[PDB]
Design an enzyme around this catalytic site. Structure first.
Site, PDB file in Angstrom:
ATOM      1  CD  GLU A 167      28.792   7.970 -19.207  1.00 36.60           C
ATOM      2  OE1 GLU A 167      28.748   9.204 -19.340  1.00 36.60           O
ATOM      3  OE2 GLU A 167      29.204   7.205 -20.091  1.00 36.60           O
ATOM      4  N   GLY A 171       0.807  -1.203   0.000  1.00 40.49           N
ATOM      5  CA  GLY A 171       0.000   0.000   0.000  1.00 40.49           C
ATOM      6  C   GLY A 171       0.842   1.256   0.000  1.00 40.49           C
TER       7      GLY A 171
HETATM    8  N1  LIG Z   1      12.795  -8.766  -1.329  1.00 43.60           N
HETATM    9  C1  LIG Z   1      12.124  -8.348  -0.261  1.00 43.60           C
HETATM   10  N2  LIG Z   1      10.774  -8.091  -0.359  1.00 43.60           N
HETATM   11  C2  LIG Z   1      10.082  -7.665   0.721  1.00 43.60           C
HETATM   12  C3  LIG Z   1      10.720  -7.476   1.932  1.00 43.60           C
HETATM   13  N3  LIG Z   1       9.798  -7.062   2.827  1.00 43.60           N
HETATM   14  C4  LIG Z   1       8.601  -6.971   2.203  1.00 43.60           C
HETATM   15  N4  LIG Z   1       8.762  -7.353   0.899  1.00 43.60           N
HETATM   16  C5  LIG Z   1       7.731  -7.392  -0.152  1.00 43.60           C
HETATM   17  O1  LIG Z   1       6.933  -6.228  -0.093  1.00 43.60           O
HETATM   18  C6  LIG Z   1       5.612  -6.533  -0.487  1.00 43.60           C
HETATM   19  C7  LIG Z   1       4.625  -5.594   0.194  1.00 43.60           C
HETATM   20  O2  LIG Z   1       5.148  -4.288   0.152  1.00 43.60           O
HETATM   21  P1  LIG Z   1       5.521  -3.514   1.507  1.00 43.60           P
HETATM   22  O3  LIG Z   1       6.267  -2.229   1.242  1.00 43.60           O
HETATM   23  O4  LIG Z   1       6.325  -4.460   2.361  1.00 43.60           O
HETATM   24  O5  LIG Z   1       4.098  -3.246   2.203  1.00 43.60           O
HETATM   25  P2  LIG Z   1       3.958  -2.999   3.789  1.00 43.60           P
HETATM   26  O6  LIG Z   1       4.791  -1.822   4.229  1.00 43.60           O
HETATM   27  O7  LIG Z   1       4.338  -4.253   4.536  1.00 43.60           O
HETATM   28  O8  LIG Z   1       2.404  -2.673   4.044  1.00 43.60           O
HETATM   29  P3  LIG Z   1       1.606  -1.512   3.267  1.00 43.60           P
HETATM   30  O9  LIG Z   1       1.519  -0.300   4.161  1.00 43.60           O
HETATM   31  O10 LIG Z   1       0.215  -1.995   2.954  1.00 43.60           O
HETATM   32  O11 LIG Z   1       2.301  -1.150   1.981  1.00 43.60           O
HETATM   33  C8  LIG Z   1       5.395  -7.989  -0.129  1.00 43.60           C
HETATM   34  O12 LIG Z   1       4.743  -8.646  -1.189  1.00 43.60           O
HETATM   35  C9  LIG Z   1       6.783  -8.562   0.045  1.00 43.60           C
HETATM   36  O13 LIG Z   1       7.021  -9.547  -0.931  1.00 43.60           O
HETATM   37  C10 LIG Z   1      12.077  -7.738   2.040  1.00 43.60           C
HETATM   38  O14 LIG Z   1      12.652  -7.590   3.115  1.00 43.60           O
HETATM   39  N5  LIG Z   1      12.777  -8.175   0.940  1.00 43.60           N
HETATM   40  N1  LIG Z   2      43.361   4.820 -25.695  1.00 38.64           N
HETATM   41  C1  LIG Z   2      42.618   5.120 -24.604  1.00 38.64           C
HETATM   42  N2  LIG Z   2      41.268   5.088 -24.717  1.00 38.64           N
HETATM   43  C2  LIG Z   2      40.479   5.373 -23.658  1.00 38.64           C
HETATM   44  C3  LIG Z   2      41.106   5.735 -22.385  1.00 38.64           C
HETATM   45  N3  LIG Z   2      40.106   5.962 -21.517  1.00 38.64           N
HETATM   46  C4  LIG Z   2      38.938   5.778 -22.184  1.00 38.64           C
HETATM   47  N4  LIG Z   2      39.165   5.423 -23.459  1.00 38.64           N
HETATM   48  C5  LIG Z   2      38.141   5.154 -24.492  1.00 38.64           C
HETATM   49  O1  LIG Z   2      37.226   6.247 -24.536  1.00 38.64           O
HETATM   50  C6  LIG Z   2      35.888   5.789 -24.706  1.00 38.64           C
HETATM   51  C7  LIG Z   2      35.021   6.442 -23.644  1.00 38.64           C
HETATM   52  O2  LIG Z   2      35.131   7.857 -23.747  1.00 38.64           O
HETATM   53  P1  LIG Z   2      35.079   8.768 -22.423  1.00 38.64           P
HETATM   54  O3  LIG Z   2      36.468   8.943 -21.864  1.00 38.64           O
HETATM   55  O4  LIG Z   2      34.158   8.159 -21.395  1.00 38.64           O
HETATM   56  O5  LIG Z   2      34.511  10.171 -22.962  1.00 38.64           O
HETATM   57  P2  LIG Z   2      34.086  11.353 -21.960  1.00 38.64           P
HETATM   58  O6  LIG Z   2      33.141  10.826 -20.909  1.00 38.64           O
HETATM   59  O7  LIG Z   2      33.408  12.455 -22.733  1.00 38.64           O
HETATM   60  O8  LIG Z   2      35.318  11.917 -21.302  1.00 38.64           O
HETATM   61  C8  LIG Z   2      35.907   4.286 -24.520  1.00 38.64           C
HETATM   62  O9  LIG Z   2      35.523   3.639 -25.734  1.00 38.64           O
HETATM   63  C9  LIG Z   2      37.331   3.915 -24.168  1.00 38.64           C
HETATM   64  O10 LIG Z   2      37.763   2.812 -24.967  1.00 38.64           O
HETATM   65  C10 LIG Z   2      42.585   5.739 -22.340  1.00 38.64           C
HETATM   66  O11 LIG Z   2      43.197   6.027 -21.290  1.00 38.64           O
HETATM   67  N5  LIG Z   2      43.247   5.434 -23.459  1.00 38.64           N
END
Ligand SMILES: Nc1nc2c(ncn2[C@@H]2O[C@H](COP(=O)(O)OP(=O)(O)OP(=O)(O)O)[C@@H](O)[C@H]2O)c(=O)[nH]1
Ligand SMILES: Nc1nc2c(ncn2[C@@H]2O[C@H](COP(=O)(O)OP(=O)(O)O)[C@@H](O)[C@H]2O)c(=O)[nH]1
Ligand SMILES: Nc1nc2c(ncn2[C@@H]2O[C@H](COP(=O)(O)OP(=O)(O)OP(=O)(O)O)[C@@H](O)[C@H]2O)c(=O)[nH]1
Ligand SMILES: Nc1nc2c(ncn2[C@@H]2O[C@H](COP(=O)(O)OP(=O)(O)O)[C@@H](O)[C@H]2O)c(=O)[nH]1
Ligand SMILES: [Mg+2]
Ligand SMILES: [Mg+2]
Lengths: 45, 47, 427, 50, 433, 428, 432
Positions: E246, E136
């Site tokens: 990113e 909920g």
């Molecule tokens: N993976 C995971 N799921 C959880 C966990 N605790 C609850 N759930 C899931 O959350 C669902 C219900 O949502 P909740 O946010 O827990 O609801 P609530 O706070 O208990 O009660 P409401 O106020 O009615 O929303 C259930 O179907 C559970 O499967 C947890 O610890 N891990």
């Molecule tokens: N030759 C070389 N290529 C690089 C290096 N670092 C990243 N790249 C290449 O650059 C690309 C990613 O670009 P990026 O650096 O994230 O661009 P920016 O986020 O705009 O700065 C990837 O395909 C990488 O293969 C480096 O140190 N040497």
């Protein structure tokens, strides 16, 4: 070597301990610059 | 028709990628196909 | 006197140019800190070209570092030769240009280009005469393809006689580290073709080939892939940093190698490459360099030069060599293999010879060839675009920062106009 | 040549002792999974005793 | 500098967050009292001069029985006492209560705290909203939280780690009703909507991890390793660093289509870890294998549209590209025509950490495949059939219409799915010349 | 100077080729490290025939070794003289050829073909003048007859002016190690007719017979037989690496011994072939050598030389000596048994004296003969092929990857054309 | 790198491999856990520090022999995923190993086959180990084979199988489903060596004096064949013969692919000390019509392609004058369209011994492999037993019960007769 550490900080300074760590790297070198001067301009001891 | 809990024991036998393709071997590839074709640029040796 | 402002941009470029500032650093002697502790006097003679000078005998790298994300500043600063740079050239940004050409060129990137040019003005003005610029980036990324092409365009208007070099990292056929990679590359090449003088194309797969087939390294990182690009980055600019029996500077390799104005998409290669165990079994004489470098396996572009005609070639040799052997092989390569060179140009060779060899090696050379096989590289990015543009691909991003579909039509078409002119002079 | 052979040799050993340290820290995980299962078997049998 | 505020809505979200936040305090040194016993904790933790690493999160449920364990358990001293905002009566699996009736009194107080957690950040990278898809408050209050964040924040990454109902396992009889109503109104304001069901986790931590009788505690630990890999390039450094914005140009096709999937590769147990070597080749085959998919929608019955690899640990980057090319030669893993590309690599350097008393094994490598498959349309059509099988005679509605919600929204919610069904059917086709 | 590129191919070829670079190194003074430490000078001015220059005074062998398996090469590398060849001219594939001739010629050997070709041309152009190529292989083998004929079909089409010497172990009657061996042989002669010019056929039979009977070598291995092949590989080329008073190279040995274009099938032979006990009981004067080199026991082929006649003889002699002797007691052979010789050329003997003797030995003389009594090396395979191909025998591999059926008929029709071509002048 | 993916199916296959994998563990330095105190290669993989991984896909539709590996001394060598047990046996039923219960496990084992192949680089092929007649042996092997070829393409498949013994059978249906599995292991089976049950008891009675040993003493004899036949993919030496080498040198026309096997120095401790086992006697013991492993007189048929895989101090001339002497004696008839008829392979490693076993140490050994026609009489003693059932409708309602069309038995019969007449129309001598 305290100047090597100071230039190794990040370019941006945006958190409270990074302000503080820059300040503990500030005054550690400032007390050395005051000290490198008194032992340079006085040849006799 | 046995259920999935009785089948392999899983909730569902989500079938696998590795059932329907040929083994082309992952022996290290020479990348481009143009690494090996005809005569390449060969300048002369010393005389 | 001639000086080269190294604008390095883009995660890739900010790394594929940081190694350059480690190799050129060693080539001229400059040590980690910035002091000159080398050997020969020549090392500290043309330092002005790439390095400036600060009180205390410390040469600061003339390099502006640009990345819209302030995270690769920390990577390049914490490197080995990372404290060598000066802080005010680290012109960083706040938001991320996540793999989108528009947020480097039109939006958020645009609010840094003003702050980059003022730094670019500072390094350029404080100089007797500019040789030109040099942009080390990657085509296929956000801030590299996005801002870098814009940053090319602004400095081309401001200083419109300078040699605009660029070492571009072109996309690969085989693998893709980016899925909007054909989009960013196709859009960018549009700006490169009218705003650059020499575009050097280096793509990762070709570096993979050299580092295993010829170098025999089982674990190639993105560090030794940048070492080879740095070697050919150094090789093109060595006759204006070091002496030689026949020098060729950057503009000399621009006049002599661009037949028609748009023919500037080049493809490099480094000559003395040996594996770890084959280095003693192999000789060191000039014939060994020339056959290895014109070879297709030692090529830093994927486009194989044997499906095309060499319009122009240089081999900027480096070593204590004999000019006649560095004349006879260039004659021999144009007579025996005389079907893979064009015929409307009788000689297609600039045989530049520097004197100072690189560190360790006794000879070297850097291939630069304006082959017609470059069209294959750009052709591939064209079907990789029109397969995406047809069933209109990831564009809900690209239009959203404020551009139009008209730009995508012209970027592909100008790139298709480009590949036809490489075939108008191929046949 | 030889100077970086040793650098290439000393890089092989640190991955070799890196993988040996991997095997030994991985060796601590099946004997904590063994002791968990052993204590559960003792817990079931002592639950039968009580 | 790169911050991600994480609001965890519902019992499912906070219990998932109890596994994500124990993992984040193990990677970074962070003792459970929030005191380190450098700048890599500024995505999920704040900082005061004394050394208090206050986590950037805001937990909300309308039922005070699952966050009061956080205010009494061993992880109490970490969390800010006011970030944990409980309600007084639950929505009780009724979308109408959590969105329109019993969630309206607690929507301003939560949104005021999300104000006070974004003023503190320099640049907000994006949001990580963990909730459920059948509850909920996991459906209703989440829906109210999505639409009202996006009118003051505007353009910002809003990623969605939800718990989709299983195909035949259900813990509620009214899950198909809350299913349609919360993806009809959180589809226009959602950037990524990573779906993870419950059944696939049960099989994954029985098939690979030889642990029969798994509980919810060891199901959420796999969820923790997902988000610790997605938010790994931000905190820690490596080659090809790949961020939240990113991702959200490399994984999201047509702006309707924003529902990727999540698979972890090295999910091998402790005994089988000896009896395997793990290189990048077999872990990148594990993700593309449908058995390690963490949704019970079959990826072989569809086409991969965009596929985002998140490597993590000792992965030598060449061996990546060799492993990628083999998958493009396989005819079984089928890709679409409008992506000649379709791989996005990211290489983080620090290895995957292990939670003590955890079921996973200690591995040097990881993959977090975020793949945008056409086969999630199978998942929606399954409970779309479930909705049209109870509303045909209007089964569970008097609980819904009696809590300030008109019955027109149900038909609007159905017809919005029929668009989303159509879009995922429209995209997949091959363009014929 | 005059240069020879070696082309080690096949399981045999990698072995008997390796034995060549163990004998030719010992004669030229080259050491397993690769640094010359010999005593004389004449083993140094002609290094540039088999041994290329490397920095450090080092003489790296010119030898592209090729094989479709890792196999032999790991053994060649991990051997006594195995730290000499370039690491990139050790070119190998992985998957087995499996004695299927067409597999090594129309499939997997067609992927390794350019890589071995790339090394050849790299090593070929980097010379002053090549004298010729030199490929050693097996006709009945796997990565030999299959891949080798492809190498001797692709380096002649691009260098059609150069000598193609090939030392090729031919199939035998009795000493058999494989079952499909005469399939491989009769399919490989069809390529060794129109391409190779200097094919020295050599058996395995007499190589045992030289060892266990003549040498009194108790257990013939696969190794000591290769020392005999390396001896008849050296002496042929010893007038172009070592000085002499009458020198003859490979082309010299071609023109004066092949009458018709299709007589390029030859017959090898040593001359001071001896034992461990008879050497003190004997004297290596050149009157002896002629008897022990024109005979049938010291012949390195199985085929008997009295069933026919030598069309032309050559004797590349080695050592310090006169030549009244090896010119007239060589002429006495022309007169005494004029039955086993020919009459359409008056003299059919070419002499070629070196100066420096072999290592150890005294007055050796590598004996090469061109006979029409090589015919039983060429019909006995042909009868064996017809006996099999009659009922379409082991061919479901050979026809599987592309070879058709008339290809097999051409390989026996162009065989028995060559069978009749040597017998056309036999009757004389 | 060279490798072979063995897969062992049925109670017969599992424990045949168990002695084989024990033997493969003692040539290489591999401890039973799998950690040594670059030839450990084809039948072992290596993961990380020291763990040595075999390349088996151990499988059975019934849990019994597989969980013996789980609780036996080789428990920390094989994987918890390499040992794929089932739910219930096929119980001597081809229909319940190929259509109902065999279908129920075939998808999981192809995954483990393929996942085991993707750490490999250059595979020559597989090593199907089974028994003709035992349900899972008849059923699952046929189901494994059909999907193996259509998926893996052209790869060398070896089928070391148990042929139904001529005199006694520990099954009532063994001449009733062996005909059926010859319908499938005939068109995707490249080379399919057999050891029928009885003669190996006769081998371990005359040569080995040991009277009344148990099950395991004949599986060690099989494992020595498996080692020597897969020896040149491994331990280095002279002229080397791989898996691909075999099929071009053993099998005639595409359907002759059922060769025989014969070990040579099958010798006790007391025999070895007073009879010298030089090459000359050893190569002749294989051609004795009492030492050959399938109980059928090889004199009644003609040998068509013989491949003698030698092993040890086997200096080349000694085999090579010997092979001539076999071609001189006239009771061994060689077909005249194959004049050569002889392959030789020389390995250098000595034949290993189990610490506890009969099989006394000797420096030379032969693994004789031939396509004789005299295996057709074993198929003539099998097919007529099948006719004696089917004429009056024997155990048919429990083959049609789990799904099988009635004409499948006639189809297997006529392809069986097709095989029978095949080896004689190729065994008629060359007449002009
Ligand atoms: N993976 C995971 N799921 C959880 C966990 N605790 C609850 N759930 C899931 O959350 C669902 C219900 O949502 P909740 O946010 O827990 O609801 P609530 O706070 O208990 O009660 P409401 O106020 O009615 O929303 C259930 O179907 C559970 O499967 C947890 O610890 N891990
Ligand atoms: N030759 C070389 N290529 C690089 C290096 N670092 C990243 N790249 C290449 O650059 C690309 C990613 O670009 P990026 O650096 O994230 O661009 P920016 O986020 O705009 O700065 C990837 O395909 C990488 O293969 C480096 O140190 N040497
Ligand atoms: N030659 C030989 N044959 C064996 C051996 N062990 C078992 N067999 C044969 O194997 C058959 C027994 O059935 P298996 O093939 O092992 O199959 P299974 O696993 O028992 O499965 P079901 O028979 O369907 O219950 C018998 O007919 C035996 O002839 C052995 O050690 N040597
Ligand atoms: N003299 C000699 N001959 C050998 C040796 N090894 C193999 N052979 C011959 O090679 C032939 C078999 O060739 P094979 O191994 O099939 O060659 P491949 O097919 O190219 O691999 C036989 O005639 C053997 O006599 C050796 O070491 N010495
Ligand atoms: Mg609740
Ligand atoms: Mg059974």
């Amino acid at each position: 070597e305290v100047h090597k550490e100071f230039q190794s900080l990040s370019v941006f300074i945006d958190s409270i301990p990074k302000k503080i760590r820059k300040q503990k790297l500030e005054e550690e070198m400032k007390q050395l610059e005051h000290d490198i001067g008194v032992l340079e301009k006085h040849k006799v001891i | 028709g046995k259920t999935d809990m009785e089948r392999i024991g899983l909730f569902s036998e989500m079938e696998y990628i590795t059932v329907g393709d040929k083994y082309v071997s992952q022996f290290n590839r020479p990348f481009n196909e143009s690494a090996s074709k005809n005569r390449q640029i060969l300048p002369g040796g010393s005389k | 006197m001639r000086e080269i402002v190294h604008l390095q941009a883009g995660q890739c470029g900010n790394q594929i140019g940081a190694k350059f500032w480690e190799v050129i650093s060693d080539e001229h002697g400059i040590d980690p800190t910035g002091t000159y502790h080398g050997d020969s006097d020549l090392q500290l003679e043309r330092i002005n070209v790439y390095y400036n000078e600060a009180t205390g005998g410390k040469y600061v790298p003339r390099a502006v570092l640009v990345d819209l994300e302030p995270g690769t500043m920390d990577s390049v600063r914490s490197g080995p030769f990372g404290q060598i740079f000066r802080p005010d050239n680290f012109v960083f940004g706040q938001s991320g240009a996540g793999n989108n050409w528009a947020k480097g060129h039109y939006t958020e990137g645009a609010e840094l280009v003003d702050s980059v040019l003022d730094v670019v003005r500072k390094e350029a003005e404080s100089c007797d005469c500019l040789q030109g610029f040099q942009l080390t980036h990657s085509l296929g990324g956000g801030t590299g393809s996005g801002m870098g092409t814009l940053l090319i365009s602004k400095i081309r208007e401001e200083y419109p006689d300078r040699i605009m070099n660029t070492f571009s990292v072109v996309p690969s056929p085989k693998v893709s580290d980016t899925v909007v990679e054909p989009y960013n590359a196709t859009l960018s090449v549009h700006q490169l073709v009218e705003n650059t003088d020499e575009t050097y194309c280096i793509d990762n797969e070709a570096l993979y080939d050299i580092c295993f087939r010829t170098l025999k390294l089982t674990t190639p990182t993105y560090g030794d892939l940048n070492h080879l690009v740095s070697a050919t980055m150094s090789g093109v600019t060595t006759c204006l940093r070091f002496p030689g029996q026949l020098n060729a500077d950057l503009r000399k390799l621009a006049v002599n190698m661009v037949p028609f104005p748009r023919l500037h998409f080049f493809m490099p290669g480094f000559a003395p490459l040996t594996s770890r165990g084959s280095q003693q079994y192999r000789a060191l004489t000039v014939p060994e360099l020339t056959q290895q470098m014109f070879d297709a396996k030692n090529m830093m572009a994927a486009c194989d030069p044997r499906h095309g005609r060499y319009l122009t070639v240089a081999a900027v040799f480096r070593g204590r060599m004999s000019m006649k052997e560095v004349d006879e092989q260039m004659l021999n390569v144009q007579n025996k293999n005389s079907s893979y060179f064009v015929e409307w140009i009788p000689n297609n060779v600039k045989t530049a010879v520097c004197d100072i060899p690189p560190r360790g090696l006794k000879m070297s050379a850097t291939f630069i060839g304006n082959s017609t096989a470059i069209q294959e590289l750009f052709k591939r990015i064209s079907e990789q675009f029109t397969a995406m543009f047809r069933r209109k691909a990831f564009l809900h991003w690209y239009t959203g920062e404020g551009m139009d579909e008209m730009e995508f039509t012209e970027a592909e078409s100008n790139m298709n106009d480009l590949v036809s002119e490489y075939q108008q002079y191929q046949d | 040549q030889r100077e970086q052979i040793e650098k290439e040799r000393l890089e092989e050993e640190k991955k070799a002792t890196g993988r040996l340290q991997h095997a030994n820290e991985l060796r601590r995980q099946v004997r904590e999974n063994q002791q968990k299962q052993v204590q559960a078997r003792i817990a079931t049998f002592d639950e039968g005793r009580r | 500098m790169r911050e991600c505020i994480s609001v965890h809505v519902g019992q499912a979200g906070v219990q998932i967050g109890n596994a994500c936040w124990e993992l984040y305090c193990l990677e970074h040194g962070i003792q459970p009292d929030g005191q380190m016993p450098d700048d890599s904790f500024n995505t999920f933790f704040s900082e005061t001069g004394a050394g208090k690493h206050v986590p950037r999160a805001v937990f909300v449920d309308l039922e005070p029985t699952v966050i009061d364990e956080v205010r009494t358990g061993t992880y109490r001293q970490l969390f800010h006492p006011e970030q944990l905002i409980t309600g007084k009566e639950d929505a009780a699996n009724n979308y109408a209560r959590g969105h329109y009736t019993i969630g309206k009194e607690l929507i301003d107080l939560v949104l005021d705290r999300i104000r006070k957690l974004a003023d503190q950040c320099t640049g907000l990278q994006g949001f990580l909203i963990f909730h459920s898809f059948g509850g909920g408050t996991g459906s209703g209050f989440t829906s109210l939280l999505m639409e009202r964040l996006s009118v003051d924040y505007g353009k910002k990454s809003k990623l969605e780690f939800s718990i989709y109902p299983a195909p035949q396992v259900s813990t509620a009889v009214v899950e198909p009703y809350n299913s349609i109503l919360t993806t009809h109104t959180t589809l226009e304001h959602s950037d990524c909507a990573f779906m993870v069901d419950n059944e696939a986790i049960y099989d994954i931590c029985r098939r690979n991890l030889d642990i029969e009788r798994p509980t919810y505690t060891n199901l959420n630990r796999l969820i923790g390793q997902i988000v610790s890999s997605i938010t790994a390039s931000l905190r820690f450094d490596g080659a090809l660093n790949v961020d939240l914005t990113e991702f959200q140009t490399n994984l999201v096709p047509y702006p309707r289509i924003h529902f990727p999937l999540a698979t972890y590769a090295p999910v091998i147990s402790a005994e089988k870890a000896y009896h395997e070597q793990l290189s990048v080749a077999e872990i990148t085959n594990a993700c593309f294998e449908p058995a390690n998919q963490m949704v019970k929608c079959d990826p072989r019955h569809g086409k991969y549209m965009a596929c985002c690899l998140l490597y993590r640990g000792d992965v030598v980057p060449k061996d990546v590209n060799a492993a990628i090319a083999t998958i493009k030669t396989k005819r079984t893993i089928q890709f679409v025509d409008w992506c000649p590309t379709g791989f996005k690599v990211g290489i983080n350097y620090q290895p995957p950490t292990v939670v003590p008393g955890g079921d996973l094994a200690k591995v040097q490598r990881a993959v977090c495949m975020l793949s945008n498959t056409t086969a999630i349309a199978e998942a929606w059509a399954r409970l779309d059939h479930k909705f049209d099988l109870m509303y045909a005679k209007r089964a569970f509605v008097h609980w819904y219409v009696g809590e300030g919600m008109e019955e027109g929204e149900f038909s609007e919610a159905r017809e919005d799915m029929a668009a989303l069904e159509k879009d995922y059917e429209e995209v997949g086709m091959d363009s014929v010349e």
